[PDB]
Amino acid sequence: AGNATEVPANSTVLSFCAFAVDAAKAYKDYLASGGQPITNCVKMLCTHTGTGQAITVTPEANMDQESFGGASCCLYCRCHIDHPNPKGFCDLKGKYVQIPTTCANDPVGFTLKNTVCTVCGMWKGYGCSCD
Amino acid sequence: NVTGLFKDCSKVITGLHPTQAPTHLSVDTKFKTEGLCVDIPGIPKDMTYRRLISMMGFKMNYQVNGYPNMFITREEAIRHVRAWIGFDVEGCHATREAVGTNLPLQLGFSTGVNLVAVPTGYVDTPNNTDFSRVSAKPPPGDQFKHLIPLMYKGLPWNVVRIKIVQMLSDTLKNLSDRVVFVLWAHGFELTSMKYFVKIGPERTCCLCDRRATCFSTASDTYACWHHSIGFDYVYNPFMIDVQQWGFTGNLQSNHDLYCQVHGVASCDAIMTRCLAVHECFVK
Ligand SMILES: CN(Cc1ccccc1)C(N)=O
Numbered sequence: 001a002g003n004a005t006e007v008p009a010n011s012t013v014l015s016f017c018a019f020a021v022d023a024a025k026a027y028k029d030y031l032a033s034g035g036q037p038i039t040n041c042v043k044m045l046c047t048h049t050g051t052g053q054a055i056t057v058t059p060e061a062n063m064d065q066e067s068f069g070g071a072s073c074c075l076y077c078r079c080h081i082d083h084p085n086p087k088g089f090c091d092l093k094g095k096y097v098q099i100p101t102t103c104a105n106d107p108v109g110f111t112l113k114n115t116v117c118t119v120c121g122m123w124k125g126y127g128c129s130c131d
Numbered sequence: 132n133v134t135g136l137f138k139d140c141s142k143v144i145t146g147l148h149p150t151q152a153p154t155h156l157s158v159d160t161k162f163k164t165e166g167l168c169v170d171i172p173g174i175p176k177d178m179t180y181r182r183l184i185s186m187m188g189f190k191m192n193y194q195v196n197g198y199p200n201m202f203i204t205r206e207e208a209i210r211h212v213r214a215w216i217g218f219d220v221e222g223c224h225a226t227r228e229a230v231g232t233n234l235p236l237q238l239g240f241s242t243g244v245n246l247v248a249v250p251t252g253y254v255d256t257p258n259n260t261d262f263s264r265v266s267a268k269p270p271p272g273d274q275f276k277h278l279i280p281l282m283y284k285g286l287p288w289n290v291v292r293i294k295i296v297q298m299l300s301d302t303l304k305n306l307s308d309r310v311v312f313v314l315w316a317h318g319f320e321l322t323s324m325k326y327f328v329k330i331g332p333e334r335t336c337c338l339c340d341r342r343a344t345c346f347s348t349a350s351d352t353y354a355c356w357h358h359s360i361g362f363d364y365v366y367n368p369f370m371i372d373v374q375q376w377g378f379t380g381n382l383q384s385n386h387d388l389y390c391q392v393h394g395v396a397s398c399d400a401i402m403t404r405c406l407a408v409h410e411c412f413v414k
Pocket residue numbers: 003004005139144145146147156157158159160161
Protein backbone atom coordinates (compact mmCIF):
# COMPACT_ATOMS: atom_id res chain seq x y z
CA ALA A 1 0.00 0.00 0.00
CA GLY A 2 1.13 3.57 -0.69
CA ASN A 3 2.98 5.33 -3.48
CA ALA A 4 6.80 5.59 -3.66
CA THR A 5 8.18 9.14 -3.71
CA GLU A 6 11.88 8.22 -4.01
CA VAL A 7 14.48 6.37 -6.09
CA PRO A 8 17.36 4.23 -4.65
CA ALA A 9 20.05 6.71 -5.84
CA ASN A 10 18.84 9.12 -3.11
CA SER A 11 18.63 6.64 -0.16
CA THR A 12 22.13 7.31 1.21
CA VAL A 13 22.11 11.13 1.14
CA LEU A 14 18.52 11.44 2.38
CA SER A 15 19.11 8.95 5.22
CA PHE A 16 22.31 10.81 6.26
CA CYS A 17 20.61 14.24 6.25
CA ALA A 18 17.40 12.93 7.88
CA PHE A 19 19.40 11.90 11.00
CA ALA A 20 21.80 14.89 11.09
CA VAL A 21 21.82 17.51 13.88
CA ASP A 22 22.68 20.11 11.21
CA ALA A 23 21.19 18.89 7.93
CA ALA A 24 22.54 21.80 5.79
CA LYS A 25 26.13 21.17 6.95
CA ALA A 26 25.63 17.39 6.50
CA TYR A 27 24.54 17.87 2.81
CA LYS A 28 27.43 20.26 2.09
CA ASP A 29 29.91 17.82 3.76
CA TYR A 30 28.41 14.86 1.88
CA LEU A 31 28.95 16.73 -1.45
CA ALA A 32 32.52 17.68 -0.39
CA SER A 33 33.28 13.98 0.32
CA GLY A 34 32.33 13.16 -3.31
CA GLY A 35 28.66 12.29 -2.80
CA GLN A 36 26.25 12.66 -5.72
CA PRO A 37 23.72 15.52 -5.57
CA ILE A 38 20.08 14.75 -4.75
CA THR A 39 18.24 13.77 -7.99
CA ASN A 40 14.47 13.19 -8.77
CA CYS A 41 13.75 16.95 -8.48
CA VAL A 42 10.66 18.39 -10.31
CA LYS A 43 12.22 19.87 -13.42
CA MET A 44 9.82 21.99 -15.52
CA LEU A 45 9.21 22.06 -19.27
CA CYS A 46 8.87 25.82 -19.86
CA THR A 47 9.28 28.43 -22.62
CA HIS A 48 12.48 29.94 -21.15
CA THR A 49 10.92 33.40 -21.85
CA GLY A 50 10.35 34.17 -18.14
CA THR A 51 11.52 37.07 -15.95
CA GLY A 52 14.50 35.20 -14.51
CA GLN A 53 13.45 35.97 -10.93
CA ALA A 54 14.56 33.43 -8.32
CA ILE A 55 11.31 32.31 -6.58
CA THR A 56 8.03 32.76 -8.44
CA VAL A 57 4.39 31.56 -8.45
CA THR A 58 4.67 30.25 -12.07
CA PRO A 59 7.89 29.06 -13.91
CA GLU A 60 9.97 32.09 -14.88
CA ALA A 61 13.19 30.55 -16.25
CA ASN A 62 15.02 32.73 -18.78
CA MET A 63 17.38 31.25 -21.46
CA ASP A 64 20.17 30.75 -18.85
CA GLN A 65 18.11 28.95 -16.17
CA GLU A 66 15.99 25.85 -15.50
CA SER A 67 12.73 26.05 -13.49
CA PHE A 68 12.01 23.54 -10.73
CA GLY A 69 9.14 22.89 -8.32
CA GLY A 70 10.16 24.55 -5.03
CA ALA A 71 9.61 21.73 -2.50
CA SER A 72 11.81 19.48 -4.68
CA CYS A 73 14.76 21.95 -4.36
CA CYS A 74 14.47 22.18 -0.54
CA LEU A 75 16.68 19.91 1.56
CA TYR A 76 14.22 20.13 4.51
CA CYS A 77 11.23 19.15 2.30
CA ARG A 78 13.26 16.32 0.70
CA CYS A 79 14.30 14.84 4.08
CA HIS A 80 10.93 15.55 5.75
CA ILE A 81 12.71 17.37 8.65
CA ASP A 82 12.26 20.72 10.50
CA HIS A 83 12.80 23.90 8.51
CA PRO A 84 15.32 26.12 10.36
CA ASN A 85 13.26 29.36 10.42
CA PRO A 86 11.45 30.32 13.72
CA LYS A 87 7.96 29.67 12.26
CA GLY A 88 9.09 26.32 10.71
CA PHE A 89 7.46 27.15 7.36
CA CYS A 90 9.03 26.74 3.94
CA ASP A 91 9.78 29.57 1.50
CA LEU A 92 10.21 27.21 -1.50
CA LYS A 93 7.33 24.76 -1.18
CA GLY A 94 4.33 26.07 -3.15
CA LYS A 95 6.56 28.15 -5.50
CA TYR A 96 8.86 27.55 -8.49
CA VAL A 97 12.60 28.17 -8.23
CA GLN A 98 14.78 29.27 -11.12
CA ILE A 99 18.30 27.79 -11.03
CA PRO A 100 21.20 28.79 -13.35
CA THR A 101 21.71 26.09 -16.02
CA THR A 102 25.37 25.75 -14.93
CA CYS A 103 24.12 24.74 -11.43
CA ALA A 104 21.02 22.66 -12.37
CA ASN A 105 22.90 19.40 -11.63
CA ASP A 106 22.33 20.15 -7.89
CA PRO A 107 19.24 22.35 -7.33
CA VAL A 108 19.06 21.34 -3.63
CA GLY A 109 22.64 22.46 -3.01
CA PHE A 110 22.12 25.62 -5.07
CA THR A 111 19.20 26.86 -2.90
CA LEU A 112 21.03 25.82 0.31
CA LYS A 113 24.12 27.90 -0.51
CA ASN A 114 22.62 30.92 -2.28
CA THR A 115 20.52 33.95 -1.31
CA VAL A 116 17.87 35.95 -3.14
CA CYS A 117 18.20 39.77 -3.33
CA THR A 118 15.21 41.22 -1.44
CA VAL A 119 15.21 44.32 -3.75
CA CYS A 120 15.29 42.87 -7.31
CA GLY A 121 14.31 39.24 -6.56
CA MET A 122 17.27 37.72 -8.42
CA TRP A 123 19.93 35.35 -6.96
CA LYS A 124 23.00 37.15 -5.57
CA GLY A 125 25.80 36.45 -8.03
CA TYR A 126 23.26 35.04 -10.63
CA GLY A 127 22.55 37.89 -11.45
CA CYS A 128 21.41 40.53 -8.97
CA SER A 129 22.54 43.80 -10.68
CA CYS A 130 21.94 46.17 -7.75
CA ASP A 131 25.08 46.72 -5.62
CA ASN B 132 13.36 1.36 -9.66
CA VAL B 133 11.87 2.98 -6.56
CA THR B 134 12.45 2.66 -2.78
CA GLY B 135 9.95 2.40 0.08
CA LEU B 136 11.90 5.15 1.93
CA PHE B 137 9.57 8.18 2.20
CA LYS B 138 6.70 6.25 0.54
CA ASP B 139 3.53 8.39 0.63
CA CYS B 140 1.01 6.46 2.71
CA SER B 141 -2.06 8.71 2.18
CA LYS B 142 -5.23 7.35 0.51
CA VAL B 143 -5.47 10.43 -1.85
CA ILE B 144 -5.98 9.17 -5.45
CA THR B 145 -4.10 12.14 -6.98
CA GLY B 146 -0.43 13.21 -6.79
CA LEU B 147 0.90 16.61 -5.82
CA HIS B 148 1.06 19.93 -7.63
CA PRO B 149 4.57 20.47 -9.18
CA THR B 150 5.35 23.18 -6.53
CA GLN B 151 4.38 20.96 -3.56
CA ALA B 152 5.66 17.53 -4.64
CA PRO B 153 8.97 16.64 -2.92
CA THR B 154 9.97 14.65 -6.06
CA HIS B 155 9.16 14.09 -9.78
CA LEU B 156 7.65 10.68 -8.81
CA SER B 157 5.13 12.37 -6.49
CA VAL B 158 3.90 14.99 -9.03
CA ASP B 159 0.35 14.24 -10.26
CA THR B 160 0.25 12.38 -13.62
CA LYS B 161 -1.76 15.29 -15.25
CA PHE B 162 1.34 17.54 -15.09
CA LYS B 163 3.80 15.00 -16.56
CA THR B 164 5.12 15.21 -20.15
CA GLU B 165 8.36 14.38 -22.01
CA GLY B 166 10.13 13.18 -18.80
CA LEU B 167 9.44 16.63 -17.25
CA CYS B 168 6.50 18.48 -15.60
CA VAL B 169 4.47 21.51 -16.75
CA ASP B 170 2.72 24.19 -14.75
CA ILE B 171 -0.97 24.27 -15.67
CA PRO B 172 -2.54 27.65 -14.92
CA GLY B 173 -5.96 26.98 -13.45
CA ILE B 174 -5.06 23.74 -11.60
CA PRO B 175 -4.30 25.05 -8.11
CA LYS B 176 -2.11 23.86 -5.23
CA ASP B 177 -3.77 21.84 -2.41
CA MET B 178 -3.64 23.89 0.83
CA THR B 179 -5.16 21.38 3.28
CA TYR B 180 -3.41 18.00 2.73
CA ARG B 181 -1.86 15.76 5.42
CA ARG B 182 0.17 12.96 3.78
CA LEU B 183 1.84 10.41 6.08
CA ILE B 184 5.41 9.75 4.85
CA SER B 185 7.06 6.38 5.62
CA MET B 186 10.33 6.29 7.57
CA MET B 187 10.95 2.63 6.55
CA GLY B 188 14.00 2.02 4.36
CA PHE B 189 16.85 4.14 5.75
CA LYS B 190 20.33 3.15 4.47
CA MET B 191 23.22 4.41 6.69
CA ASN B 192 26.04 3.58 4.26
CA TYR B 193 27.33 7.16 3.86
CA GLN B 194 31.10 7.79 3.95
CA VAL B 195 31.68 11.40 4.91
CA ASN B 196 34.98 12.68 6.33
CA GLY B 197 34.65 13.40 10.04
CA TYR B 198 31.33 11.59 10.55
CA PRO B 199 31.61 8.17 12.25
CA ASN B 200 29.74 5.23 10.76
CA MET B 201 26.69 4.05 12.78
CA PHE B 202 26.90 0.37 11.67
CA ILE B 203 30.19 -1.19 12.82
CA THR B 204 31.99 -4.48 12.07
CA ARG B 205 31.67 -7.56 14.34
CA GLU B 206 35.33 -7.03 15.36
CA GLU B 207 34.76 -3.41 16.42
CA ALA B 208 31.55 -4.42 18.28
CA ILE B 209 33.61 -7.11 20.17
CA ARG B 210 36.13 -4.45 21.31
CA HIS B 211 33.14 -2.45 22.73
CA VAL B 212 31.18 -5.34 24.30
CA ARG B 213 30.69 -3.19 27.46
CA ALA B 214 28.64 -0.72 25.32
CA TRP B 215 26.18 -3.40 24.08
CA ILE B 216 22.50 -2.71 24.54
CA GLY B 217 20.09 -5.08 22.79
CA PHE B 218 17.25 -3.11 21.14
CA ASP B 219 13.93 -4.32 19.63
CA VAL B 220 10.77 -2.43 18.67
CA GLU B 221 7.20 -3.78 18.35
CA GLY B 222 5.18 -1.60 16.01
CA CYS B 223 1.63 -0.70 15.12
CA HIS B 224 0.23 -0.16 11.55
CA ALA B 225 -0.92 3.19 10.10
CA THR B 226 -4.72 3.25 9.70
CA ARG B 227 -7.73 5.41 8.53
CA GLU B 228 -6.12 8.57 6.93
CA ALA B 229 -3.06 6.48 5.91
CA VAL B 230 -1.97 2.88 5.22
CA GLY B 231 1.40 1.35 4.34
CA THR B 232 3.79 2.08 7.24
CA ASN B 233 4.60 1.05 10.83
CA LEU B 234 4.97 3.34 13.82
CA PRO B 235 7.01 2.57 16.98
CA LEU B 236 4.77 1.28 19.82
CA GLN B 237 6.87 -0.71 22.33
CA LEU B 238 10.59 0.05 22.57
CA GLY B 239 12.51 -2.62 24.44
CA PHE B 240 16.11 -2.81 25.64
CA SER B 241 18.33 -5.58 27.09
CA THR B 242 18.18 -3.60 30.43
CA GLY B 243 14.60 -5.06 30.66
CA VAL B 244 13.04 -1.62 30.05
CA ASN B 245 9.96 -1.30 27.78
CA LEU B 246 8.75 2.19 26.83
CA VAL B 247 5.35 2.70 25.18
CA ALA B 248 5.01 5.56 22.69
CA VAL B 249 1.94 7.27 21.30
CA PRO B 250 1.66 6.18 17.60
CA THR B 251 3.43 9.09 15.87
CA GLY B 252 4.43 9.74 12.22
CA TYR B 253 5.89 12.33 9.86
CA VAL B 254 3.04 14.04 8.03
CA ASP B 255 3.78 16.22 5.02
CA THR B 256 1.65 19.36 4.72
CA PRO B 257 1.58 22.38 2.34
CA ASN B 258 4.06 24.18 4.65
CA ASN B 259 6.29 21.61 6.40
CA THR B 260 6.46 18.08 7.89
CA ASP B 261 4.34 17.78 11.04
CA PHE B 262 5.67 15.23 13.56
CA SER B 263 2.38 14.22 15.12
CA ARG B 264 0.04 11.53 16.47
CA VAL B 265 -1.50 9.37 13.72
CA SER B 266 -4.32 6.76 13.67
CA ALA B 267 -2.99 3.26 14.24
CA LYS B 268 -3.98 -0.34 14.91
CA PRO B 269 -1.97 -3.18 16.52
CA PRO B 270 -0.80 -6.05 14.20
CA PRO B 271 -3.65 -8.51 13.48
CA GLY B 272 -1.99 -11.61 15.00
CA ASP B 273 -2.51 -13.31 18.39
CA GLN B 274 1.22 -13.50 19.37
CA PHE B 275 1.03 -9.64 19.69
CA LYS B 276 -2.26 -9.56 21.74
CA HIS B 277 -0.38 -7.77 24.58
CA LEU B 278 -0.02 -4.72 22.24
CA ILE B 279 -3.80 -4.02 22.21
CA PRO B 280 -3.94 -2.17 25.64
CA LEU B 281 -0.63 -0.40 24.78
CA MET B 282 -2.48 1.66 22.13
CA TYR B 283 -3.94 3.63 25.14
CA LYS B 284 -0.83 3.65 27.40
CA GLY B 285 1.68 5.57 25.28
CA LEU B 286 3.77 8.59 26.22
CA PRO B 287 4.46 11.51 23.81
CA TRP B 288 7.76 11.15 21.91
CA ASN B 289 9.29 14.23 23.64
CA VAL B 290 8.99 12.26 26.95
CA VAL B 291 9.94 8.85 25.43
CA ARG B 292 13.30 10.10 24.05
CA ILE B 293 14.17 11.80 27.40
CA LYS B 294 13.57 8.42 29.10
CA ILE B 295 15.72 6.54 26.54
CA VAL B 296 18.61 8.95 27.06
CA GLN B 297 18.20 8.71 30.85
CA MET B 298 18.12 4.87 30.79
CA LEU B 299 21.22 4.59 28.55
CA SER B 300 23.14 7.21 30.55
CA ASP B 301 22.44 5.38 33.84
CA THR B 302 23.41 1.97 32.40
CA LEU B 303 26.52 3.01 30.48
CA LYS B 304 28.16 5.94 32.36
CA ASN B 305 30.50 3.55 34.22
CA LEU B 306 30.81 0.97 31.38
CA SER B 307 31.67 2.73 28.12
CA ASP B 308 32.21 6.01 26.30
CA ARG B 309 29.49 4.94 23.73
CA VAL B 310 26.43 2.74 22.99
CA VAL B 311 26.34 -0.17 20.51
CA PHE B 312 22.69 -1.13 19.87
CA VAL B 313 22.64 -4.91 19.16
CA LEU B 314 19.82 -5.61 16.67
CA TRP B 315 18.14 -8.54 14.86
CA ALA B 316 16.69 -7.55 11.40
CA HIS B 317 17.54 -3.87 11.88
CA GLY B 318 15.07 -2.12 9.52
CA PHE B 319 12.33 -1.21 12.00
CA GLU B 320 14.83 -0.48 14.82
CA LEU B 321 16.68 1.96 12.51
CA THR B 322 13.27 3.52 11.55
CA SER B 323 12.58 3.88 15.32
CA MET B 324 16.03 5.54 15.85
CA LYS B 325 14.92 8.43 13.57
CA TYR B 326 12.62 9.32 16.54
CA PHE B 327 15.48 9.68 19.12
CA VAL B 328 18.94 9.71 17.47
CA LYS B 329 20.95 12.55 15.89
CA ILE B 330 24.32 12.24 14.11
CA GLY B 331 27.20 14.49 13.10
CA PRO B 332 30.93 14.97 13.66
CA GLU B 333 32.47 13.62 16.92
CA ARG B 334 31.96 16.22 19.69
CA THR B 335 33.11 16.54 23.31
CA CYS B 336 30.90 16.92 26.39
CA CYS B 337 30.14 20.52 27.41
CA LEU B 338 31.18 19.79 31.07
CA CYS B 339 34.15 17.39 30.62
CA ASP B 340 36.63 16.06 27.99
CA ARG B 341 34.69 12.79 27.35
CA ARG B 342 33.17 12.15 23.87
CA ALA B 343 29.56 13.32 23.59
CA THR B 344 26.93 10.58 23.57
CA CYS B 345 23.82 12.85 23.99
CA PHE B 346 22.43 15.98 22.31
CA SER B 347 19.96 18.55 23.69
CA THR B 348 17.69 20.34 21.16
CA ALA B 349 16.57 22.89 23.78
CA SER B 350 20.09 24.17 24.39
CA ASP B 351 22.00 23.00 21.26
CA THR B 352 24.59 21.41 23.57
CA TYR B 353 26.31 17.99 23.88
CA ALA B 354 27.00 15.73 26.82
CA CYS B 355 28.63 12.44 27.78
CA TRP B 356 26.63 9.77 29.74
CA HIS B 357 27.63 11.41 33.09
CA HIS B 358 26.29 14.90 32.29
CA SER B 359 23.17 14.19 30.19
CA ILE B 360 20.32 15.13 32.64
CA GLY B 361 17.45 16.68 30.60
CA PHE B 362 19.03 15.68 27.23
CA ASP B 363 16.57 14.43 24.62
CA TYR B 364 18.72 12.85 21.85
CA VAL B 365 21.12 9.95 21.62
CA TYR B 366 24.07 11.34 19.64
CA ASN B 367 26.36 9.28 17.36
CA PRO B 368 25.29 5.81 18.57
CA PHE B 369 26.76 2.63 17.07
CA MET B 370 24.98 -0.55 16.03
CA ILE B 371 25.25 -4.03 14.58
CA ASP B 372 22.70 -6.43 13.09
CA VAL B 373 23.20 -9.96 14.49
CA GLN B 374 20.85 -11.41 11.83
CA GLN B 375 23.45 -10.49 9.18
CA TRP B 376 26.04 -12.86 10.70
CA GLY B 377 24.89 -15.85 8.60
CA PHE B 378 22.16 -17.33 10.82
CA THR B 379 19.31 -19.37 9.31
CA GLY B 380 15.88 -19.01 10.97
CA ASN B 381 14.34 -16.60 13.49
CA LEU B 382 15.97 -14.99 16.57
CA GLN B 383 14.49 -17.37 19.18
CA SER B 384 15.56 -20.58 17.38
CA ASN B 385 19.17 -19.32 17.13
CA HIS B 386 19.21 -17.86 20.66
CA ASP B 387 17.86 -21.17 22.10
CA LEU B 388 20.79 -23.15 20.66
CA TYR B 389 23.15 -21.62 23.26
CA CYS B 390 20.80 -20.37 25.96
CA GLN B 391 17.94 -21.79 27.97
CA VAL B 392 17.31 -19.02 30.54
CA HIS B 393 15.65 -16.24 28.41
CA GLY B 394 12.04 -17.02 27.36
CA VAL B 395 7.69 -8.51 24.21
CA ALA B 396 10.25 -5.96 22.92
CA SER B 397 12.59 -6.12 25.98
CA CYS B 398 12.61 -9.95 25.81
CA ASP B 399 13.66 -9.90 22.12
CA ALA B 400 16.27 -7.24 22.94
CA ILE B 401 17.63 -9.47 25.77
CA MET B 402 17.75 -12.50 23.45
CA THR B 403 19.55 -10.45 20.74
CA ARG B 404 22.36 -9.26 23.08
CA CYS B 405 22.52 -12.83 24.54
CA LEU B 406 22.91 -14.50 21.11
CA ALA B 407 25.53 -11.87 20.19
CA VAL B 408 27.64 -12.58 23.30
CA HIS B 409 27.48 -16.38 22.78
CA GLU B 410 28.30 -16.12 19.06
CA CYS B 411 31.22 -13.66 19.49
CA PHE B 412 32.92 -14.97 22.64
CA VAL B 413 32.58 -18.77 22.28
CA LYS B 414 34.84 -20.60 19.67
C1 LIG C 1 2.12 10.42 -9.24
N1 LIG C 1 1.08 9.66 -8.57
C2 LIG C 1 1.53 8.62 -7.64
C3 LIG C 1 2.11 9.19 -6.36
C4 LIG C 1 1.31 9.93 -5.50
C5 LIG C 1 1.83 10.46 -4.33
C6 LIG C 1 3.15 10.24 -4.01
C7 LIG C 1 3.95 9.50 -4.85
C8 LIG C 1 3.44 9.00 -6.04
C9 LIG C 1 -0.23 9.91 -8.75
N2 LIG C 1 -0.59 10.81 -9.67
O1 LIG C 1 -1.09 9.31 -8.07
